[PDB]
Amino acid sequence: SLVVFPFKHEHPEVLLHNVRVAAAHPRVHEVLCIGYERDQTYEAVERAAPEISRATGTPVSVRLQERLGTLRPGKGDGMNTALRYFLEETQWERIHFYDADITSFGPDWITKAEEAADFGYGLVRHYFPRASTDAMITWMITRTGFALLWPHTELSWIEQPLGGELLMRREVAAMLYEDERVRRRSDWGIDTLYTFVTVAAGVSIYECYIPEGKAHRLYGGLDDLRTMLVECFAAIQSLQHEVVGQPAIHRQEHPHRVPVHIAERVGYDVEATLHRLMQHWTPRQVELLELFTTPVREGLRTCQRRPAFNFMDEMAWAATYHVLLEHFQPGDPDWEELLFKLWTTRVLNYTMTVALRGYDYAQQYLYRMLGRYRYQAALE
């Protein structure tokens, strides 16, 4: 198999460790690191490369991402450049992706995936336990969107649609490299694209569970995620009129109980997030609210004077979602900030009226949210 780690600003030690793990694995026949730019990490890898290759019998290659798409040049270009290398410069039967910044990586990751592929699945997705205030894009944007737009489909049932850890059969990779909507998505929307398209094409999917969780880079306040938020919402938006094919087999490994350290983690700085809600206002944003339902309009307007979020419950979010699908303009600075504030109030609502009632309570809620969304959408 080919194992790929795409990287941007990672520390060298962290990535080289993971490369060492993959290179040591009996089933891995090459590893490719795909860099955003040539930096300290890129060079570090390049010189450790031929030395790891002889100690293991596995070639390791570094390469720059190239401009294959047309949105922000970001992770998409990275993964697609990797697709091209896999498909055009090698004859390997399978391709693995794993985020570069993982600190809990081990060979069972690889093993579990390969075995599932042996079992016959076209695509294998690693999923993990996550803290109840993490994954807020995943739930509030990606899964919610898939549920509101494609209720009868397998799409909202994917556990981790933004997740970067996965394995594909060659033909699946080829199919994806050849799909214009996929190639286009050079920014953060790549994972959403791979998820959507593999499902839509009737690829057979297995989601295997990694109990240890994903130890990666940590994040402080909510606006760390702002670009990602817009790009991820954009991705859904652009798919909104697509149609989905007959589904294949979709099965998911049963999840273990959550590590205590994970159930006990807090995803963001509440104070700072409340502060941020009252910032970066413009008259244009205030006028743009006129597009929204009264409680959302009035809700968000209050945020100019003081933080408000009780209004942003599950129904209000769905209504807000429909307006955004219709009027949101990627590239528009005001729409971008409005989406951010708006998502922000949803997260806070969820944090105080759900996450605070406890981990299990939150998880049960989130799944029931999707359920209710799926059911509402299929009546209209």
Q: Which residues bind ligand GDP (CB under 6 A)?
A: 6-8, 10, 34-36, 65, 74-75, 78, 99-101, 164, 216-217
Enter the tokens of residue 118. Answer: 């042996």
Q: What secondary structure letter does DSSP report for 287?
A: H
Q: What's the min distance (Å) between Cβ of 162 and Mn ion? A: 11
Q: Which one among 216, 265, 301, 372 touches Mn ion, defined by CB under 5 A?
A: 216
**Residue 280 touches which member of Mn ion, ligand GDP, none, C-beta under 5-8 Å by kind:** none
Q: Phi and psi dihedrals of 331, rounded to 5?
A: 95, -20
Gap between the Cα atoms of 281 and 115, Å rounded: 52
Under the criterion CB under 5 A, does residue 217 sit at the interface with Mn ion? yes
Q: What's the min distance (Å) between Cβ of 96 and ligand GDP? A: 13
**Residue 299 touches which member of Mn ion, ligand GDP, none, C-beta under 5-8 Å by kind:** none
Q: What's the min distance (Å) between Cβ of 301 and ligand GDP? A: 31
Q: What's the min distance (Å) between Cβ of 36 and Mn ion? A: 14
Which amino acid does the sequence have at 172? V
Q: Are 336 and 330 in contact (CB under 8 A)?
A: yes
Question: Which helix (H) or strand (E) covers residue 83, if one does?
Answer: helix 75-89
**Residue 36 touches which member of Mn ion, ligand GDP, none, C-beta under 5-8 Å by kind:** ligand GDP
CA atoms within 13 A of residue 270's CA, in its CB half-sphere: 11
Distance of CA 324 to the CA centre of its chain: 20
Under the criterion CB under 5 A, does residue 101 sit at the interface with Mn ion? yes
User: Is 101 annotated as ligand-binding?
Assistant: yes
Under the criterion CB under 5 A, does residue 10 sit at the interface with Mn ion? no
- Our CB check for Mn ion shows the closer of 77 and 101 to be 101
Q: What secondary structure letter does DSSP report for 141?
A: I
Under the criterion CB under 5 A, does residue 8 sit at the interface with Mn ion? no
Gap between the Cα atoms of 238 and 150, Å rounded: 14
| Nearest residue to 77 (alpha-carbon basis) of 6, 165, 173, 179 | 6
Token pair 């860099």 in the structure block, residue: 35
Bind-site residues for GDP-alpha-D-mannose: 6-10, 34, 65, 75, 99-100, 162, 191, 217, 219
Bind-site residues for (R)-glycerate: 130, 135-138
Interface residues with Mn ion (CB under 5 A) are 101, 216-217
